[model samples]
Target: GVNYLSGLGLSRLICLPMALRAAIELNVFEIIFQAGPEAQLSPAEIVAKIPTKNPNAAIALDRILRMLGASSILSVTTMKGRVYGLTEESRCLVADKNGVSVVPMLLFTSDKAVVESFYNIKDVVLEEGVIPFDRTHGMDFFAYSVNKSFNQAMGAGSTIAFDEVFKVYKGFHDLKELVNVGGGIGTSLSNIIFKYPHIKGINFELPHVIADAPNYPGVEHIAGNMFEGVPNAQNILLKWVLHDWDDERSIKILQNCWKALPEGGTVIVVEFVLPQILGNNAESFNALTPDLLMMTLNPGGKERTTTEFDGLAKAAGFAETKFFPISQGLHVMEFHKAT
Candidate 1:
């Protein structure tokens, strides 16, 4: 009496990304946002506004809108013809009045290379044991796609993450200066300095990356590699960096952080601290999905449990480690050196 394949689950899993990608590439969210509140546009009207250059772009736009409407990303109504309007999910993709957009993050995640790496995952574990991304792209994630969009994606995501972070903790109020290792464009550090204006920020990143990094008002960009050494600072921030490395390399990075700080200095790491036991809950599932990506993309990159983090901090010669639960699925791990 029941049909196993009746649900839209499979459809979403298989085709939703393509629809989302089309919407982003077509700037559907921006167009809808500019059309005025409660605005609706027919497929032809929307197509006319877009510059596809291809004569068939209108036809393609119609198809993309249909898919997005079917997925509830857009609200569709059949007027004289099909009319489309933005839904809540679609509006979130648009830049706010502040000009902050998560579209870059979406683009980064749905990139063809990122998506294709999943297909090569079997080979990654079966034969090579190297990350599928490195095997496919011939370089690591950070070094491979060094573009403005990629940099903006890192900034947008980090800005949002740190926003949630500042909501829970103000411990950073005491620090004089912070060195953000692997900090691209200083978005997270910029947020930190903005909050604690008295605190200076040292945005430490790869020479190639820092070369093109825009200057943040109170942040200084320093070009260097973390694996080699780190600059001295009162606080060291490693936001979402370690998950791209293995235990050994991660420890080395932390050890470098330890060396960069004084006896009372601190290291703050922002990442998804995985649970010891994988489960069916949304947060655990959220962590599990990205952990797989890390495993498939980076040589030693994988999510870690709190205990695992403790081990890393101890190995790095920290006196103690503390965790602040900033959001449902994210955390800030604080590693303290002896006073």
Candidate 2:
């Protein structure tokens, strides 16, 4: 949907997923992310590290790398032999500077559970209130998180997007106690506490989810429902959280967020704001496309417009909404505790 590259010919279209998978399996992105922006490794050098289950693994991996290079996913330098490296895009996949990994994100296309949902994307988008995956699997995306294979694929893909945004919030210097409402699995919060030593955090989520949440030195993982109550804190950080529910439910969550904060507290929302036009800016497209994808998966889970955000903040008893930009198409919205 992002590229509308359906017009680019079927070979190129089919080539993208297969090429991406090959690069993922070979850990090509990881290699490049570790190597630095301009570093290149020869095809022979690549083949030496990975296992060759297929007889043609060497030739096959190189072919995929070259194709990815052609599409600017990877940069290919031809010496006596082919030398492969990272592009700006590829670096995002492997670089731990941000918490996302492109390798797992690509699995959304190749993973069986996700691929099967495409057959029903239309039904969920139209007649049904639930997403295609829920219609087929009898559970929504969050529920599907219990199934091992599906969970890992979805987790990997979603975390990258979340991590990309968390790094943006970590830049805010004036916070002391923060709450990560609906913070799943503690990846983003953990990253934040690890970076900012001055801040202590509460990762609030469902009881079952946070039972094993490690008692990290700077952060405490607390389990509770966002609709009911959120832990008291100076900053309420909602990362990729509220978009999962409808407006009415989101209002309740925001109200609870209001209650959780002190007089000068702030509520931070991290998500992609849909762009006004497609392809006008490629980065905005990347951000908005995922929002559409989630909408198809859940009837009430569509991304919010800025006007919608303004109204929600007002109803939730907040004074104003502030906006900030982060890496990889993520944006942050801040709502003050009626200061």
Candidate 3:
């Protein structure tokens, strides 16, 4: 039987993230946590915990729980009737000791701004050659006012990405200061400074993004455009930053990093470097997923291969580039400045 075809057909109609978003919005994870991790709840019990505000809340809750269970986000049992329990994926949505939750990342991905942008992507590609986000919103992605969800999403995602980054790169240990260009809310920079106490951090971002940035003990927040200039530092970081721009703009940002550092200072760019040969596995698909999202949501932005990154680094006047691959297809492109 050609069951794979049926699977593909059904997949197109699935907006699983929307269901996940609904769960997050309803605080389903928290409710389950209140029940204790060892216990499972029937749809009736789960619905009972939810407020009666929504029309047909019980019915809707049941549908969402069923979908989540089917998706393996929640473990399902039918001993007496269907009961649901949180899996590791759903558990991450619950806030931990530091008050960090992956819910924001889900919210950002399923944001109306992000979802609607894709609808007019064809028009954007045909008419303006710009991203649908700019076409629909009438402004660049970052230039738009910061919503708390998106901002937190960026920070939460950075926390995971930088966790991988710190494990591999210890070069910051010797540096006096590390400037994180386009650093939103100082998430990555804060994490870096926390690990390497000897190094001070400059959380450089636009005024709007920097204004709300929290004060960290060893981190100084600066408000300025990276396209214009960057502050002086012994090392610079561009974590998940440059993929939001075209080659020209990315080169400009890199040039500023090059100019900001001393002769031996390094520019560490953390991003996904597209696999030289796209594979048939989930990793390969995941790598290209962001590239499509970037193309649709960011102006002149697309993921690049190692060669493309190397060319950009060379164009930015870096003497050489080094690669350090990390978990989940992420790579740190280290561009060295010559003496």
Candidate 4:
């Protein structure tokens, strides 16, 4: 049954990312974050605290906040002379006081550069054998992270997903060290170290990638290429990484991971292995569409099947594998290094 995906793309609802970015750039999210869990404030109070270097702060902020309220990131009580507070969606961006904002991550998808690249996905998919991002931008996604603005945005997006994924991976403990390979912007590893004080983690990636990583509690950032070598650790996290390369290169990266991991230790892959077929004739779909979108954009990369993951892991040297499912159509597959 065709559910009319055409309308979904065309609807003004599709402009949500742009509208949200407008809110973020105007510091509306940061305002709510800074406000803490206190009483909601009037528009004037928000404007007073905002660092409005721009000349049109009044009109700009009002319009931005109004758009966000319309989008549900912020809620407004017009009856009380335009009060503002965090909505369920906006609360997710609050990282507590101390001046760290995760809203930057949400803003990245709508970033002028990224959005432009995304629009070129069709050419990327059809012309060169490269992902849309690379084809459009002339570098891979990892390279894109070197741009401080874009990296922060991706990190923010990853952080939200990390918080959700961490709950499902409940048993990962007693780690001597964890190396977050390809840990763009270092958000996931940052959260882990924050959660488990005793454990140390390295957010390892290219020099440029590490350069863009923000300093945070309990995590250290190391700059190095994953394809060449990654810092040794008890657990290596390959989150959304393998699908970026072809089978051979994926095997190479996995082999390096095998070499880096201690005997009986594991490599954790946080990615989606799309289901073979869609079931449930009624519910809205997620994993399936994203997988197809990936296929269109990336020549060698797309969501894998469980069998495909098994083959890739075996080629790289893991002997045992286990899969843990998480909410919102995601999976964490653990592969143990063979003794």
TM-scores for every predicted model: 0.77, 0.76, 0.80, 0.63
Give the per-residue Cα lDDT of candidate 2 at 148. 62
CA lDDT, candidate 2, residue 325: 68
Name the runs in model 3 displaced over 4 angstroms. Answer: 1-12, 53-60, 134-146, 184-191, 203-225, 277-289
Which pairs of residues collide in candidate 4? 105-153
Instruction: Output the better candidate (2/4) by lDDT.
Output: 2
**Tens-digit lDDT track of model 1 for 1-339:** 767777646666667788888878888878877889988887778877887678887677888888888878898898866788888767879887667777887887677777877877888658856678887788887677447666677678776666668878777888888898988877768877887999989999999888888878799998898999999989898888888888999999999999989989999888977777777664585467677766665556788888899999999999999988876568888999998
Which 10 successive residues of model 3 have the least lDDT summed? Answer: 9-18
Identify the runs in model 1 with alpha carbons over 4 angstroms from their true place: 1-12, 38-41, 51-62, 76-83, 134-149, 183-191, 200-232, 275-292
For residues 1-339, write the lDDT of model 4, one tens digit per residue: 777887575565666667676666656666766777744766667778777676676666676567667767677788635777887657766664443455665455455666666677677636755566776677776556437766576465455556667666774566767888987778767778878877788889889867877897778888988889878888898988987778899999999999998898889888766666667421113355445445543567666777788899998888988888775556788889877
Candidate 2 residue pairs in clash (backbone atoms < 3 Å):
93-102, 100-160
Clashing pairs in 3: none
Global CA lDDT computed for model 4: 0.72
Write out the backbone clash pairs for model 1: none
How many pairs in model 1 have backbone atoms within 3 A of each other, for residues 3 or more apart or on separate chains, i.e. clashes? Answer: 0
Residue 61 Cα positional deviation in candidate 1, in Å, after optimal superposition: 3.8
In model 2, which regions exceed 4 Å deviation?
A: 1-8, 29-50, 53-63, 76-84, 95-100, 138-172, 184-191, 210-214, 218-223, 280-282
User: Roughly what TM-score does model 3 have, to 2 decimal places?
Assistant: 0.80
All models: lDDT? 0.82, 0.73, 0.81, 0.72
Give the lowest summed-lDDT range of ten residues in model 1: 142-151
Ranking by lDDT: 1, 3, 2, 4
How far off is model 2, as Cα RMSD? Answer: 4.7
